[PDB]
Design a binder for these strands. Structure first.
Ligand code: ATP
Ligand code: MG
Ligand code: MG
Ligand code: ZN
Lengths: 77, 373, 154, 24, 50, 100, 107, 56
RNA sequence: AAAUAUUAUGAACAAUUUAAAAAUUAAUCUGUUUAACUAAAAUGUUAUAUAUAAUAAUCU
RNA sequence: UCGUCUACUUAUUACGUUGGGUUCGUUGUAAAGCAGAUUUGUUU
């Protein structure tokens, strides 16, 4: 199994799972992402981490993910 | 089977956390930047209960790294920072000599015991007090609290599925009694109720329970305190209990305040014990050896002396099978009633104790004021 | 054999025995090593107090804590002032917020230990967890618990 | 109220001056 | 031989690089290497000859 | 009696009478709050890999020759501050890559 | 003495693995009274039926008993094992079954 | 004593010989039944007191 | 800013920090006294008990 | 968290005798757990 897990869509929530732990936390889930966060499953060195990133096409640094968007460079027809 | 877990100090636990690579590092990206730790963990681990997540986070098994060279332990209410890591142990992390909290691993019920109609009827009859959090039952004489070495014997641990009136899970016994001791037994209905009531049954300084006993002979003092030090050693088919007046490293103390309420002249006595500790056969040993008055029917401590011929008009001293005259009478609870007093549950005296009291002319049902409400 | 001398004040840094005690990641269930009290107090307990300005006819007893935020600014659901006086002198009881319910005692403040902060607190406001009076909370921890939403957890 | 949680409380002497009547 | 264990940093593990000494080790005999730190010069000299 | 022992005359901190060559200084913030060096700016942020920090190709080959891939926590913090041309105090324990 | 009393209690209240051997058992006397005394029968609104296949046909029709004594050496009925039936099953001896009913079919 | 029979056997194995002290009027009542039940290889010297009061 | 006199009033952890505890289970600390008379003068503690609520009927 | 455990087995027969060999388990917890104490009436 690969060591880098990419973001995946959140699983469908059941009744109790969608129900918050407290009635005051009902507004906490107002703005939430529909996809999970990327993860690394072990302890590795920097060359191994870079090779895993290149093989999985998934960056680990949130700063790099934010600064390098996947956008089309051509103008829309 | 949990047979691979070892006692670990905080230093060893931190060292194992540092060494073990069975960790997952969730990167806090822009989409989860600013969320709460409990929210993040609940969204990322649907198979974990909130109790499990709370225990992990508060005990420090789940932590976070803010690129500072050190680990950061947080509360469930702390917000996540951008471009940090959340370190969570994996399944393989708990396969080493480090035991996880109760919620991490998954237990299997397996078999389910069947209770008959008469068994359920008597289980409902034994109920004394019921609450949203606790159930106090009247365990009788001769009924084991737990399954003994012989698995064919009935027990309160086996009758337990009969006291889940409306709950989904059966209650949990908060304290165990001897096979011969009869009286009030506390069963927590909720897991949180059990965790909160466990504090009430550890060694204390103020007693919250009474033991009414009929001892053979009257002690030299009407009231006082008893303190022994018990050492338990494994024997052939039993336990060797060594009682000492001085403490030892392998010993544990047993303390109880006794009061002689009423008595015959020098042949029998009615004594109320108020214990402060929880030791095996505590009351029986302290009556037989400290007070030098064996409990009526206590054949294990002072066998021939526990069946006196003075009560031969009432009890035949030749059968040697009469029930032990020791009864867990009254117990205080942390829950209050509508009047503002702590709820004190009282159990009626058994048949043999009521018979002895009536033959000696003593009132059976009397409130013991030494344990307030 | 060989004897040396090291003061216990050098080892006091290692007094906490767990993550919960060293970093305060949860409620201090009567296991707290380091305490922070106001400079000058000799009786080491925290004080959540109320201001009395009038008779029970004009100013009600729960209105003393109006300067505090939270449920003390609402009128309670239960009132035990009329009729037989409570044994523990509980005058009012607010609505249950999850597993916590706020009570107001009568007389001088009773000094108890909040299991969330771990401090001895002297106040008339006691929050009981799951109707079990062994686990009590000061009003400050009660307001903080409700604010975060941990009412059903702690 | 000017009380607060951390701030300690004191017992102020009740103002017993003669007050003007409110007006519609 | 050097008993090198993987150094454990947060989410980073590596192995120790060879020693940066101006005299490379060329003899490998059976035994553990050690330094005996003494006080003063005379004690170092004496233990050397003992 | 209220106290029978004796209190030390060290008003600054523990071991105020000794010389710095013998005793080590406290690093707790309650003590470093008045220190002229440790009360000032302190760099704690780190850089994960050597590729994230700017290095010339000759320095890349020197690291490969020395067989060094992942930076140690002191190198993750001190390399960037020195490349910014600032007076730096590289403080680290023994055997953590303080030389490089 | 305590072991004797505990075994007698486990015989009185039917426990797992308990085979009734004493004819003075309360349920055995209940069955004997239902068989013999008509006033007890009319007061309890109960009746005693014999025959494995007869009980099977009654279950098919929709009638199930509340106590099913099975003589030791016979199998438990599949309809009694089924979940929809709430009939308690009891193990009795040969002479106990003879006392409960002179000609016992085993059930 | 049937519970500590095993501890007594271990102590006998550890010792080189055994020295029993009994009362001649109640020889077997005073003697330890564990030593009578267990066959031990260490020789034992028994000392019966009050032999002049006991039966010849 | 000089020339002179004195100086022992005494804190342990945690978090953050080449920027801000903003983690409220966190405080970041030197208190406190200080007022010519006559006038003038701008300052604050009220409660709202029903709208994801409350009061009610039919029927499956 | 006050559980329970002076009898089994290799043989011998008779309606008890004689030779050998010798624990199980409920629940909670992974610390919020583990030794000992938990006392105070200038009634002098
Ligand atoms: N990033 C790295 N990865 C692996 N090994 C390293 C790394 N950096 C340095 N080392 C190794 O660590 C060893 C010790 O380095 P260094 O001399 O800097 O330690 P030091 O802290 O100066 O020790 P001292 O204070 O005792 O002089 C060197 O031999 C080097 O090979
Ligand atoms: Mg100057
Ligand atoms: Mg203890
Ligand atoms: Zn609190």
């Amino acid at each position: 199994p690969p060591i880098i897990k990419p973001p995946l869509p959140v699983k469908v929530g059941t009744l109790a799972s969608t129900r918050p732990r407290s009635p005051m936390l009902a507004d906490e889930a107002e703005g939430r992402p529909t996809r999970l966060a990327p993860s690394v499953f072990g302890r590795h060195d920097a060359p191994a981490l870079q090779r895993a990133q290149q093989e999985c096409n998934q960056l680990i640094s949130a700063s790099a993910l934010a600064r390098i968007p996947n956008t089309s460079p051509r103008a829309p027809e | 089977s949990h047979a691979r877990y070892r006692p670990l100090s905080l230093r060893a636990r931190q060292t194992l956390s540092e060494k073990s690579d069975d960790l997952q590092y969730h990167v806090v990206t822009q989409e989860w930047f600013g969320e709460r730790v409990d929210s993040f963990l609940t969204c990322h681990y649907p198979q974990w209960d909130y109790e499990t997540i709370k225990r992990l986070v508060q005990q420090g098994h789940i932590y976070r790294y803010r690129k500072n060279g050190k680990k950061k332990f947080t509360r469930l209410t702390d917000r996540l920072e951008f471009d940090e890591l959340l370190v969570v142990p994996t399944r393989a992390f708990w396969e080493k000599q480090l035991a996880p909290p109760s919620g991490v691993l998954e237990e299997t019920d397996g078999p389910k015991f069947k209770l008959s109609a008469t068994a359920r009827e008597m289980a409902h009859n034994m109920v004394l007090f019921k609450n949203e959090h606790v159930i106090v039952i009247n365990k009788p004489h001769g009924l084991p609290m737990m399954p003994t070495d012989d698995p064919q014997e009935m027990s309160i641990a086996a009758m337990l599925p009969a006291w889940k009136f409306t709950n989904v899970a059966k209650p949990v016994v908060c304290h165990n009694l001897d096979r011969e001791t009869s009286g009030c037994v506390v069963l927590a209905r909720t897991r949180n109720a059990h965790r909160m009531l466990g504090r009430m049954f550890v060694k204390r300084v103020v007693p919250n329970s009474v033991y009414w006993s009929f001892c053979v002979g009257k002690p030299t003092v009407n009231y006082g305190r008893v303190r022994m030090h018990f050492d338990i050693t494994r024997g052939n088919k039993g336990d060797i209990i060594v009682a000492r007046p001085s403490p030892t490293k392998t010993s544990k103390v047993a303390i109880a305040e006794f009061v002689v309420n009423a008595s015959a002249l020098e042949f029998g006595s009615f004594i109320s014990f108020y214990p402060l500790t929880t030791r095996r056969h505590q009351e029986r040993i302290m009556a037989a050896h400290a007070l030098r008055c064996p409990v009526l029917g206590d054949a294990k401590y002072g066998g021939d002396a526990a069946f006196p011929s003075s009560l031969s008009l009432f009890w035949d001293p030749e059968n040697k099978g009469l029930p032990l005259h020791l009864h867990h009478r009254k117990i205080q609870l942390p829950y209050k009633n509508t009047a503002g007093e702590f709820i004190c549950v009282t159990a009626p005296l058994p048949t043999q104790m009521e018979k002895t009291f009536k033959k000696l002319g003593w009132p059976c049902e009397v409130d013991d004021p030494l344990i307030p409400g | 054999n060989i004897k040396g001398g090291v003061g216990s004040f050098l080892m006091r840094r290692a007094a906490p025995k767990s993550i919960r005690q060293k970093y305060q990641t949860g409620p201090q269930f009567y296991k707290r090593k380091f305490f922070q009290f106001q400079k000058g107090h000799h009786r080491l307990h925290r004080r959540i107090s109320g201001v009395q300005t009038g008779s029970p006819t004009h100013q009600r007893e729960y209105e003393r804590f109006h300067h505090l935020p939270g449920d003390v600014r609402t009128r309670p659901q239960f009132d035990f002032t009329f009729g037989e006086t409570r044994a523990d002198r509980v005058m009012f009881a607010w609505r249950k917020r999850g597993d916590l319910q706020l009570y107001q005692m009568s007389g001088r403040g009773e000094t108890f230990v909040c299991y969330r902060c771990g401090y001895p607190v002297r106040s008339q406001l006691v929050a009981v967890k799951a109707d079990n009076w062994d686990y009590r909370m000061c009003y400050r921890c009660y307001t903080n618990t409700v604010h975060r939403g941990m009412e059903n957890d702690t | 109220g000017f009380g607060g949680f951390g701030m300690s409380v004191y017992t102020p002497k009740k103002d017993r001056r003669f007050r003007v009547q409110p007006l519609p | 031989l050097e008993g090198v264990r993987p150094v454990h940093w947060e989410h980073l593990t590596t192995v120790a690089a060879p020693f940066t000494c101006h005299v490379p080790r060329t003899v490998f005999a059976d035994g553990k290497r050690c330094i005996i730190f003494t006080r003063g010069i005379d004690c170092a000299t004496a233990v050397y000859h003992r | 009696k209220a106290y029978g022992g004796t209190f030390s005359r060290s008003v600054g901190e523990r071991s105020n009478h000794l010389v710095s060559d013998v005793v080590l200084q406290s690093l707790s913030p309650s003590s470093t709050h008045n220190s002229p060096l440790l009360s000032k700016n302190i760099k704690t942020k780190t850089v994960t890999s050597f590729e994230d920090m700017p290095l010339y190709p000759e320095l890349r080959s020197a690291l490969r020759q020395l067989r060094i891939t992942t930076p140690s926590p002191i190198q993750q913090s001190a390399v960037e501050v020195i490349m910014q041309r600032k007076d730096t105090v590289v403080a680290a324990p023994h055997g953590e890559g303080k030389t490089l | 003495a305590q072991r004797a009393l505990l075994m007698q209690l486990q015989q009185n209240v039917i426990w797992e693995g308990t085979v009734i051997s004493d004819e003075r058992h309360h349920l055995i006397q209940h069955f004997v009274k239902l068989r013999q005394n008509p006033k007890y029968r009319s007061s309890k609104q109960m009746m005693v039926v014999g025959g494995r296949h007869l009980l099977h046909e009654l279950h098919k029709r929709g009638y199930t008993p509340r106590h099913l004594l099975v003589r030791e050496g016979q199998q438990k009925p599949k309809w009694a094992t089924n979940t929809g039936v709430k009939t308690e099953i009891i193990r009795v001896d040969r002479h106990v079954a003879d006392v409960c009913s002179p000609g016992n079919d085993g059930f | 004593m049937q519970l500590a029979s095993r501890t007594l056997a271990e102590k006998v194995k550890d010792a080189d010989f055994v020295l029993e002290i009994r009362d001649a009027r109640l020889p077997f009542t005073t003697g330890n039944p564990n030593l009578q039940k267990i066959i031990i290889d260490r020789p034992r010297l028994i000392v019966f007191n009050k032999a002049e009061m006991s039966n010849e």
